[PDB]
Protein backbone atom coordinates (compact mmCIF):
# COMPACT_ATOMS: atom_id res chain seq x y z
CA UNK A 1 0.00 0.00 0.00
CA UNK A 2 2.87 2.38 0.74
CA UNK A 3 4.55 1.78 -2.60
CA UNK A 4 1.24 2.45 -4.35
CA UNK A 5 0.73 5.65 -2.36
CA UNK A 6 4.19 6.69 -3.60
CA UNK A 7 3.82 5.62 -7.22
CA UNK A 8 0.63 7.67 -7.44
CA UNK A 9 2.66 10.59 -6.07
CA UNK A 10 5.21 10.21 -8.87
CA UNK A 11 2.47 9.82 -11.48
CA UNK A 12 0.46 12.85 -10.42
CA UNK A 13 3.55 15.05 -10.15
CA UNK A 14 4.73 14.05 -13.63
CA UNK A 15 1.32 14.37 -15.28
CA UNK A 16 1.15 17.85 -13.77
CA UNK A 17 4.68 18.85 -14.81
CA UNK A 18 4.04 17.85 -18.41
CA UNK A 19 0.73 19.70 -18.67
CA UNK A 20 2.42 22.77 -17.19
CA UNK A 21 5.22 22.65 -19.76
CA UNK A 22 2.71 22.20 -22.59
CA UNK A 23 0.80 25.21 -21.27
CA UNK A 24 4.03 27.23 -21.34
CA UNK A 25 4.61 26.18 -24.95
CA UNK A 26 1.05 27.14 -25.91
CA UNK A 27 1.53 30.53 -24.26
CA UNK A 28 4.70 31.04 -26.31
CA UNK A 29 2.80 30.10 -29.47
CA UNK A 30 0.17 32.69 -28.57
CA UNK A 31 2.89 35.29 -27.94
CA UNK A 32 4.31 34.67 -31.42
CA UNK A 33 0.82 34.85 -32.94
CA UNK A 34 0.47 38.24 -31.23
CA UNK A 35 3.88 39.47 -32.40
CA UNK A 36 2.82 38.60 -35.95
CA UNK A 37 0.01 41.17 -35.89
CA UNK A 38 2.53 43.99 -35.46
CA UNK A 39 4.28 43.16 -38.72
CA UNK A 40 0.86 42.50 -40.24
CA UNK A 41 -0.38 46.00 -39.38
CA UNK A 42 2.63 48.32 -39.51
CA UNK A 43 3.27 47.27 -43.11
CA UNK A 44 -0.37 47.91 -44.01
CA UNK A 45 -0.20 51.36 -42.43
CA UNK A 46 3.04 52.22 -44.21
CA UNK A 47 1.61 50.98 -47.51
CA UNK A 48 -1.53 53.10 -47.23
CA UNK A 49 0.56 56.08 -46.14
CA UNK A 50 2.92 55.74 -49.11
CA UNK A 51 -0.13 55.49 -51.37
CA UNK A 52 -1.60 58.71 -49.96
CA UNK A 53 1.68 60.63 -50.03
CA UNK A 54 2.66 59.60 -53.55
CA UNK A 55 -0.86 60.29 -54.83
CA UNK A 56 -0.67 63.77 -53.32
CA UNK A 57 2.72 64.19 -54.99
CA UNK A 58 1.31 63.15 -58.38
CA UNK A 59 -1.50 65.66 -57.88
CA UNK A 60 0.82 68.52 -56.92
CA UNK A 61 2.98 67.79 -59.96
CA UNK A 62 0.09 67.55 -62.42
CA UNK A 63 -1.32 70.80 -61.00
CA UNK A 64 0.94 72.91 -63.22
CA UNK A 65 -1.04 74.31 -66.14
CA UNK A 66 -0.13 77.40 -68.15
CA UNK A 67 0.19 81.02 -67.07
CA UNK A 68 -0.82 83.06 -70.15
CA UNK A 69 0.07 86.62 -69.00
Amino acid sequence: TQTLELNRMRGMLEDDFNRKKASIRQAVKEENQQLDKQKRDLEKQSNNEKLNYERTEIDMVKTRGQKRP
Binding site: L4, L6, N7, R10, G11
Partner: protein, 420 residues
Amino acid sequence: MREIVHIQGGQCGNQIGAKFWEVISDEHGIDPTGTYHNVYYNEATGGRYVPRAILMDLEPGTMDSVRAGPFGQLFRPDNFVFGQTGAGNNWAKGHYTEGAELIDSVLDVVRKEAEGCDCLQGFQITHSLGGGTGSGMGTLLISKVREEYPDRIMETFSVVPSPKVSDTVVEPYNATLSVHQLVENADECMVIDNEALYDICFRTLKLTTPTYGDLNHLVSAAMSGVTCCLRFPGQLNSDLRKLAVNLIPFPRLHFFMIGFAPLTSRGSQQYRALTVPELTQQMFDAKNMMCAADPRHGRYLTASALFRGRMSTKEVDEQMLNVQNKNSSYFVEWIPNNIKSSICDIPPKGLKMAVTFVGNSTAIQEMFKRVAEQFTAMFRRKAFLHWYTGEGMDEMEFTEAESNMNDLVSEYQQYQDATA
Protein backbone atom coordinates in the same frame (compact mmCIF):
# COMPACT_ATOMS: atom_id res chain seq x y z
CA MET B 1 32.90 10.37 17.56
CA ARG B 2 34.46 9.54 14.19
CA GLU B 3 33.51 12.81 12.54
CA ILE B 4 33.92 13.93 8.91
CA VAL B 5 35.23 17.24 7.61
CA HIS B 6 33.46 18.46 4.48
CA ILE B 7 35.99 20.16 2.20
CA GLN B 8 34.55 21.45 -1.07
CA GLY B 9 35.97 23.05 -4.19
CA GLY B 10 35.00 23.85 -7.77
CA GLN B 11 31.45 24.56 -8.88
CA CYS B 12 30.71 20.85 -9.33
CA GLY B 13 32.02 20.13 -5.86
CA ASN B 14 29.90 22.92 -4.42
CA GLN B 15 26.71 21.78 -6.17
CA ILE B 16 27.21 18.14 -5.18
CA GLY B 17 27.94 19.25 -1.62
CA ALA B 18 24.77 21.31 -1.44
CA LYS B 19 22.74 18.33 -2.64
CA PHE B 20 24.58 16.02 -0.23
CA TRP B 21 23.76 18.21 2.74
CA GLU B 22 20.17 18.31 1.47
CA VAL B 23 19.98 14.51 1.54
CA ILE B 24 21.67 14.22 4.94
CA SER B 25 19.25 16.83 6.27
CA ASP B 26 16.04 15.21 5.11
CA GLU B 27 17.42 11.88 6.39
CA HIS B 28 18.56 13.04 9.84
CA GLY B 29 15.35 15.04 9.95
CA ILE B 30 16.96 18.49 9.89
CA ASP B 31 14.75 21.05 8.26
CA PRO B 32 16.51 23.74 6.18
CA THR B 33 16.13 26.14 9.11
CA GLY B 34 18.72 24.11 11.02
CA THR B 35 16.69 22.39 13.76
CA TYR B 36 15.53 18.81 14.36
CA HIS B 37 11.94 18.09 13.33
CA ASN B 38 27.80 14.51 15.86
CA VAL B 39 29.13 12.46 12.93
CA TYR B 40 28.40 15.27 10.45
CA TYR B 41 26.87 18.37 12.02
CA ASN B 42 27.90 20.54 14.97
CA GLU B 43 25.62 21.60 17.79
CA ALA B 44 25.23 25.37 17.98
CA THR B 45 23.93 27.38 20.93
CA GLY B 46 20.34 28.37 20.30
CA GLY B 47 19.37 24.90 19.12
CA ARG B 48 20.93 24.85 15.66
CA TYR B 49 22.91 22.18 13.81
CA VAL B 50 25.54 23.87 11.66
CA PRO B 51 26.99 21.34 9.19
CA ARG B 52 30.75 20.96 9.52
CA ALA B 53 31.89 22.01 6.06
CA ILE B 54 34.12 24.39 4.12
CA LEU B 55 33.63 25.85 0.65
CA MET B 56 36.48 27.13 -1.50
CA ASP B 57 36.46 28.57 -5.02
CA LEU B 58 38.06 31.50 -6.82
CA GLU B 59 34.64 32.97 -7.66
CA PRO B 60 32.28 34.40 -5.04
CA GLY B 61 29.36 33.77 -7.39
CA THR B 62 29.06 30.12 -6.42
CA MET B 63 28.62 31.54 -2.90
CA ASP B 64 25.34 33.20 -3.83
CA SER B 65 24.24 30.30 -6.05
CA VAL B 66 24.60 27.79 -3.22
CA ARG B 67 23.13 30.12 -0.59
CA ALA B 68 20.17 30.80 -2.88
CA GLY B 69 18.91 27.22 -2.93
CA PRO B 70 17.16 25.66 0.06
CA PHE B 71 19.30 24.12 2.80
CA GLY B 72 21.75 26.95 2.20
CA GLN B 73 21.00 28.51 5.58
CA LEU B 74 22.63 25.46 7.18
CA PHE B 75 26.13 26.46 6.05
CA ARG B 76 27.58 28.99 8.45
CA PRO B 77 28.36 32.44 6.97
CA ASP B 78 32.01 32.02 7.99
CA ASN B 79 33.07 28.96 5.98
CA PHE B 80 32.47 30.71 2.65
CA VAL B 81 36.09 31.67 2.01
CA PHE B 82 36.29 32.48 -1.70
CA GLY B 83 38.93 33.99 -3.97
CA GLN B 84 38.47 36.96 -6.27
CA THR B 85 40.33 36.79 -9.58
CA GLY B 86 39.14 33.37 -10.72
CA ALA B 87 41.29 30.65 -12.28
CA GLY B 88 39.51 30.36 -15.63
CA ASN B 89 40.35 26.64 -15.81
CA ASN B 90 44.13 26.90 -15.55
CA TRP B 91 45.82 24.41 -13.24
CA ALA B 92 48.63 26.82 -12.37
CA LYS B 93 46.07 29.53 -11.55
CA GLY B 94 44.42 27.33 -8.92
CA HIS B 95 47.60 25.60 -7.77
CA TYR B 96 50.51 28.09 -7.77
CA THR B 97 49.41 31.74 -7.73
CA GLU B 98 45.94 31.85 -6.18
CA GLY B 99 46.74 28.72 -4.19
CA ALA B 100 49.74 30.09 -2.29
CA GLU B 101 47.78 33.21 -1.23
CA LEU B 102 44.43 31.83 0.01
CA ILE B 103 45.19 28.20 0.87
CA ASP B 104 46.91 29.65 3.95
CA SER B 105 43.57 30.80 5.37
CA VAL B 106 41.97 27.61 4.05
CA LEU B 107 44.36 25.53 6.16
CA ASP B 108 43.80 27.85 9.12
CA VAL B 109 40.04 27.38 9.13
CA VAL B 110 40.41 23.65 8.36
CA ARG B 111 42.60 23.22 11.43
CA LYS B 112 40.08 25.22 13.46
CA GLU B 113 37.37 22.77 12.38
CA ALA B 114 39.71 19.84 13.02
CA GLU B 115 40.82 20.39 16.61
CA GLY B 116 37.23 21.27 17.53
CA CYS B 117 36.38 17.58 17.14
CA ASP B 118 37.43 14.67 19.35
CA CYS B 119 38.17 11.95 16.75
CA LEU B 120 38.31 13.29 13.19
CA GLN B 121 38.14 9.88 11.56
CA GLY B 122 38.51 10.93 7.94
CA PHE B 123 38.27 13.69 5.37
CA GLN B 124 35.78 14.17 2.54
CA ILE B 125 36.32 16.14 -0.68
CA THR B 126 33.86 17.19 -3.39
CA HIS B 127 35.50 18.63 -6.49
CA SER B 128 36.30 18.03 -10.16
CA LEU B 129 39.27 16.95 -12.24
CA GLY B 130 38.73 19.42 -15.08
CA GLY B 131 38.43 22.96 -13.79
CA GLY B 132 41.50 24.87 -12.68
CA THR B 133 39.89 25.97 -9.42
CA GLY B 134 38.51 22.56 -8.47
CA SER B 135 41.37 20.31 -9.55
CA GLY B 136 44.22 22.64 -8.63
CA MET B 137 43.13 23.96 -5.26
CA GLY B 138 41.79 20.51 -4.38
CA THR B 139 45.01 18.61 -4.98
CA LEU B 140 46.97 21.36 -3.24
CA LEU B 141 44.70 21.28 -0.19
CA ILE B 142 44.94 17.48 -0.15
CA SER B 143 48.74 17.54 -0.26
CA LYS B 144 48.75 20.15 2.51
CA VAL B 145 46.40 18.25 4.81
CA ARG B 146 48.14 14.92 4.24
CA GLU B 147 51.37 16.62 5.24
CA GLU B 148 49.35 17.98 8.19
CA TYR B 149 47.55 14.81 9.36
CA PRO B 150 49.54 11.71 8.33
CA ASP B 151 47.32 9.50 10.53
CA ARG B 152 43.90 10.20 9.01
CA ILE B 153 42.52 8.81 5.75
CA MET B 154 41.76 10.49 2.43
CA GLU B 155 38.86 10.30 0.01
CA THR B 156 37.93 12.35 -3.06
CA PHE B 157 34.65 12.05 -4.96
CA SER B 158 36.07 13.23 -8.28
CA VAL B 159 34.31 13.66 -11.60
CA VAL B 160 36.48 12.73 -14.58
CA PRO B 161 36.32 13.61 -18.31
CA SER B 162 33.51 11.82 -20.11
CA PRO B 163 34.77 9.76 -23.08
CA LYS B 164 32.32 10.94 -25.75
CA VAL B 165 32.33 14.73 -25.25
CA SER B 166 34.51 16.97 -23.09
CA ASP B 167 33.49 19.95 -20.99
CA THR B 168 36.69 22.02 -21.23
CA VAL B 169 38.96 21.18 -24.15
CA VAL B 170 42.01 21.26 -21.86
CA GLU B 171 40.52 18.49 -19.67
CA PRO B 172 43.46 16.07 -20.22
CA TYR B 173 46.07 18.49 -18.88
CA ASN B 174 44.25 19.37 -15.66
CA ALA B 175 43.20 15.74 -15.24
CA THR B 176 46.77 14.45 -15.41
CA LEU B 177 48.08 17.26 -13.21
CA SER B 178 45.49 16.28 -10.60
CA VAL B 179 46.16 12.55 -10.85
CA HIS B 180 49.95 12.97 -10.65
CA GLN B 181 49.55 14.37 -7.12
CA LEU B 182 46.34 12.57 -6.13
CA VAL B 183 47.67 9.04 -6.69
CA GLU B 184 50.35 9.60 -4.05
CA ASN B 185 48.38 11.28 -1.23
CA ALA B 186 44.85 9.87 -1.48
CA ASP B 187 43.26 6.58 -0.45
CA GLU B 188 39.72 6.53 -1.89
CA CYS B 189 39.41 8.12 -5.34
CA MET B 190 35.70 7.60 -6.03
CA VAL B 191 35.53 8.30 -9.76
CA ILE B 192 32.33 9.51 -11.42
CA ASP B 193 31.53 10.59 -14.98
CA ASN B 194 28.61 12.67 -16.22
CA GLU B 195 27.83 10.28 -19.08
CA ALA B 196 27.24 7.33 -16.76
CA LEU B 197 24.82 9.37 -14.65
CA TYR B 198 23.11 10.54 -17.84
CA ASP B 199 22.61 6.96 -18.99
CA ILE B 200 21.40 5.98 -15.52
CA CYS B 201 18.78 8.71 -15.20
CA PHE B 202 17.55 7.97 -18.73
CA ARG B 203 17.72 4.20 -19.24
CA THR B 204 17.00 2.89 -15.75
CA LEU B 205 14.52 5.58 -14.66
CA LYS B 206 12.85 6.77 -17.92
CA LEU B 207 13.25 10.35 -16.67
CA THR B 208 13.24 12.31 -19.92
CA THR B 209 14.28 15.70 -18.48
CA PRO B 210 17.33 15.18 -16.25
CA THR B 211 18.88 18.19 -14.56
CA TYR B 212 22.14 18.56 -12.68
CA GLY B 213 20.03 18.66 -9.52
CA ASP B 214 18.90 15.08 -10.09
CA LEU B 215 22.36 13.81 -11.03
CA ASN B 216 23.82 15.48 -7.95
CA HIS B 217 21.01 13.86 -5.95
CA LEU B 218 22.06 10.44 -7.24
CA VAL B 219 25.71 11.01 -6.34
CA SER B 220 24.48 12.34 -2.99
CA ALA B 221 22.65 9.09 -2.35
CA ALA B 222 25.83 7.21 -3.23
CA MET B 223 28.02 9.30 -0.91
CA SER B 224 25.53 8.99 1.95
CA GLY B 225 25.08 5.24 1.57
CA VAL B 226 28.87 4.88 1.62
CA THR B 227 29.09 5.54 5.35
CA CYS B 228 25.48 5.10 6.50
CA CYS B 229 26.40 1.78 8.13
CA LEU B 230 28.48 3.77 10.66
CA ARG B 231 26.17 6.41 12.17
CA PHE B 232 23.41 3.78 12.55
CA PRO B 233 23.17 0.47 14.39
CA GLY B 234 23.64 -2.74 12.48
CA GLN B 235 24.05 -6.49 12.82
CA LEU B 236 27.51 -6.03 11.27
CA ASN B 237 28.97 -2.53 11.28
CA SER B 238 31.88 -1.16 9.28
CA ASP B 239 33.46 2.26 8.82
CA LEU B 240 35.65 4.35 6.52
CA ARG B 241 38.73 2.26 7.37
CA LYS B 242 37.50 -1.34 7.28
CA LEU B 243 36.60 -0.40 3.72
CA ALA B 244 40.14 0.83 3.10
CA VAL B 245 41.74 -2.51 4.05
CA ASN B 246 38.98 -4.61 2.49
CA LEU B 247 39.39 -2.44 -0.62
CA ILE B 248 43.02 -1.53 -1.31
CA PRO B 249 45.54 -4.40 -1.48
CA PHE B 250 48.36 -2.01 -2.42
CA PRO B 251 49.45 1.62 -1.98
CA ARG B 252 48.32 2.53 -5.51
CA LEU B 253 45.42 0.37 -6.73
CA HIS B 254 42.91 2.33 -4.66
CA PHE B 255 40.60 3.97 -7.22
CA PHE B 256 37.01 2.89 -6.64
CA MET B 257 33.92 2.62 -8.82
CA ILE B 258 30.56 3.42 -7.26
CA GLY B 259 27.05 2.03 -7.60
CA PHE B 260 23.67 2.41 -5.93
CA ALA B 261 20.50 0.33 -5.72
CA PRO B 262 17.55 0.16 -6.09
CA LEU B 263 16.47 2.47 -8.93
CA THR B 264 13.42 2.03 -11.14
CA SER B 265 11.03 4.21 -13.12
CA ARG B 266 7.32 4.86 -12.62
CA GLY B 267 6.18 2.12 -14.99
CA SER B 268 8.40 -0.78 -13.99
CA GLN B 269 7.95 -0.03 -10.27
CA GLN B 270 4.52 -1.65 -9.97
CA TYR B 271 5.70 -5.00 -11.34
CA ARG B 272 9.19 -5.81 -10.06
CA ALA B 273 9.53 -7.35 -6.61
CA LEU B 274 12.07 -6.12 -4.05
CA THR B 275 14.31 -8.72 -2.44
CA VAL B 276 18.03 -9.43 -2.13
CA PRO B 277 18.04 -11.11 -5.58
CA GLU B 278 16.88 -7.94 -7.36
CA LEU B 279 19.11 -5.67 -5.29
CA THR B 280 22.06 -7.90 -6.19
CA GLN B 281 21.20 -7.90 -9.90
CA GLN B 282 21.04 -4.11 -9.96
CA MET B 283 24.22 -3.98 -7.87
CA PHE B 284 26.35 -5.97 -10.31
CA ASP B 285 24.47 -4.64 -13.35
CA ALA B 286 26.95 -3.23 -15.85
CA LYS B 287 25.22 0.06 -16.65
CA ASN B 288 24.01 0.62 -13.08
CA MET B 289 27.47 1.71 -11.95
CA MET B 290 28.56 5.35 -12.23
CA CYS B 291 31.75 4.76 -14.20
CA ALA B 292 32.41 5.11 -17.92
CA ALA B 293 34.01 1.66 -17.98
CA ASP B 294 31.91 -1.50 -18.25
CA PRO B 295 33.47 -3.61 -15.47
CA ARG B 296 32.71 -6.77 -17.46
CA HIS B 297 35.77 -5.99 -19.63
CA GLY B 298 38.16 -6.48 -16.72
CA ARG B 299 38.14 -7.98 -13.25
CA TYR B 300 37.84 -6.89 -9.63
CA LEU B 301 40.72 -6.89 -7.22
CA THR B 302 37.94 -6.57 -4.64
CA ALA B 303 34.51 -5.12 -4.01
CA SER B 304 32.43 -4.22 -0.98
CA ALA B 305 28.66 -3.98 -0.59
CA LEU B 306 27.05 -1.99 2.22
CA PHE B 307 23.40 -2.98 2.48
CA ARG B 308 20.77 -1.11 4.46
CA GLY B 309 17.56 -2.31 6.07
CA ARG B 310 16.60 -4.92 8.64
CA MET B 311 16.79 -8.05 6.49
CA SER B 312 18.24 -11.56 6.59
CA THR B 313 21.90 -12.51 6.27
CA LYS B 314 21.90 -16.01 4.80
CA GLU B 315 20.45 -14.51 1.63
CA VAL B 316 23.31 -12.00 1.64
CA ASP B 317 26.02 -14.62 2.08
CA GLU B 318 24.58 -17.19 -0.32
CA GLN B 319 24.10 -14.54 -3.00
CA MET B 320 27.65 -13.28 -2.55
CA LEU B 321 28.72 -16.91 -2.97
CA ASN B 322 26.52 -17.30 -6.05
CA VAL B 323 27.65 -14.08 -7.73
CA GLN B 324 31.25 -15.09 -7.02
CA ASN B 325 30.98 -18.73 -8.15
CA LYS B 326 29.04 -17.94 -11.34
CA ASN B 327 30.81 -14.75 -12.40
CA SER B 328 34.18 -16.16 -11.37
CA SER B 329 35.89 -15.42 -14.68
CA TYR B 330 35.01 -11.73 -14.41
CA PHE B 331 36.36 -11.84 -10.87
CA VAL B 332 40.00 -12.48 -10.09
CA GLU B 333 40.96 -15.80 -8.54
CA TRP B 334 44.35 -15.29 -6.89
CA ILE B 335 42.44 -13.83 -3.91
CA PRO B 336 39.89 -15.75 -1.79
CA ASN B 337 36.37 -14.45 -1.12
CA ASN B 338 37.15 -11.28 -3.03
CA ILE B 339 33.88 -9.63 -1.96
CA LYS B 340 33.02 -8.03 1.37
CA SER B 341 29.58 -7.41 2.82
CA SER B 342 28.26 -5.06 5.48
CA ILE B 343 24.78 -4.58 6.90
CA CYS B 344 22.96 -1.73 8.67
CA ASP B 345 19.57 -1.46 10.38
CA ILE B 346 17.98 1.54 8.60
CA PRO B 347 17.06 1.81 4.90
CA PRO B 348 16.61 5.24 3.28
CA LYS B 349 13.45 7.22 3.89
CA GLY B 350 10.77 5.72 1.66
CA LEU B 351 11.85 2.12 1.08
CA LYS B 352 12.77 -0.98 3.07
CA MET B 353 16.09 -1.96 1.42
CA ALA B 354 19.18 -0.36 -0.10
CA VAL B 355 22.61 -1.24 -1.46
CA THR B 356 25.73 0.88 -1.90
CA PHE B 357 28.37 -0.93 -3.96
CA VAL B 358 32.04 0.03 -4.10
CA GLY B 359 34.52 -1.66 -6.38
CA ASN B 360 38.32 -1.72 -6.54
CA SER B 361 38.45 -3.14 -10.05
CA THR B 362 40.90 -3.19 -12.95
CA ALA B 363 38.41 -1.77 -15.44
CA ILE B 364 39.21 1.92 -14.93
CA GLN B 365 42.71 1.30 -16.29
CA GLU B 366 40.97 1.70 -19.65
CA MET B 367 39.88 5.19 -18.59
CA PHE B 368 43.47 5.99 -17.68
CA LYS B 369 44.54 4.59 -21.04
CA ARG B 370 42.28 7.07 -22.81
CA VAL B 371 43.45 9.95 -20.62
CA ALA B 372 47.12 9.17 -21.28
CA GLU B 373 46.27 8.90 -24.99
CA GLN B 374 44.67 12.35 -25.01
CA PHE B 375 47.66 13.73 -23.11
CA THR B 376 50.21 12.29 -25.53
CA ALA B 377 48.25 13.62 -28.51
CA MET B 378 47.72 17.15 -27.17
CA PHE B 379 51.31 17.14 -25.86
CA ARG B 380 53.40 16.11 -28.86
CA ARG B 381 51.98 19.25 -30.50
CA LYS B 382 52.62 21.36 -27.35
CA ALA B 383 48.95 22.35 -27.64
CA PHE B 384 47.81 24.91 -25.06
CA LEU B 385 51.12 25.19 -23.25
CA HIS B 386 51.89 28.91 -22.92
CA TRP B 387 49.15 29.11 -20.30
CA TYR B 388 50.88 26.34 -18.34
CA THR B 389 54.32 27.97 -18.53
CA GLY B 390 53.40 31.66 -18.33
CA GLU B 391 52.60 31.06 -14.65
CA GLY B 392 55.77 29.62 -13.14
CA MET B 393 55.64 25.99 -14.29
CA ASP B 394 58.03 24.12 -16.57
CA GLU B 395 57.03 21.48 -19.09
CA MET B 396 59.30 18.98 -17.31
CA GLU B 397 56.71 18.29 -14.61
CA PHE B 398 54.04 17.58 -17.23
CA THR B 399 56.23 14.95 -18.88
CA GLU B 400 57.03 13.11 -15.67
CA ALA B 401 53.36 13.25 -14.67
CA GLU B 402 52.41 11.15 -17.68
CA SER B 403 55.28 8.82 -16.80
CA ASN B 404 53.71 8.28 -13.38
CA MET B 405 50.35 7.63 -15.04
CA ASN B 406 51.98 4.93 -17.17
CA ASP B 407 53.34 3.17 -14.09
CA LEU B 408 49.83 3.26 -12.62
CA VAL B 409 48.23 1.34 -15.46
CA SER B 410 51.44 -0.69 -15.77
CA GLU B 411 50.45 -2.16 -12.41
CA TYR B 412 46.73 -2.74 -12.98
CA GLN B 413 46.82 -4.80 -16.17
CA GLN B 414 49.68 -6.77 -14.61
CA TYR B 415 47.72 -8.03 -11.62
CA GLN B 416 44.84 -8.77 -13.99
CA ASP B 417 46.76 -11.76 -15.34
CA ALA B 418 49.27 -12.94 -12.72
CA THR B 419 48.18 -16.10 -10.91
CA ALA B 420 49.50 -18.62 -8.39
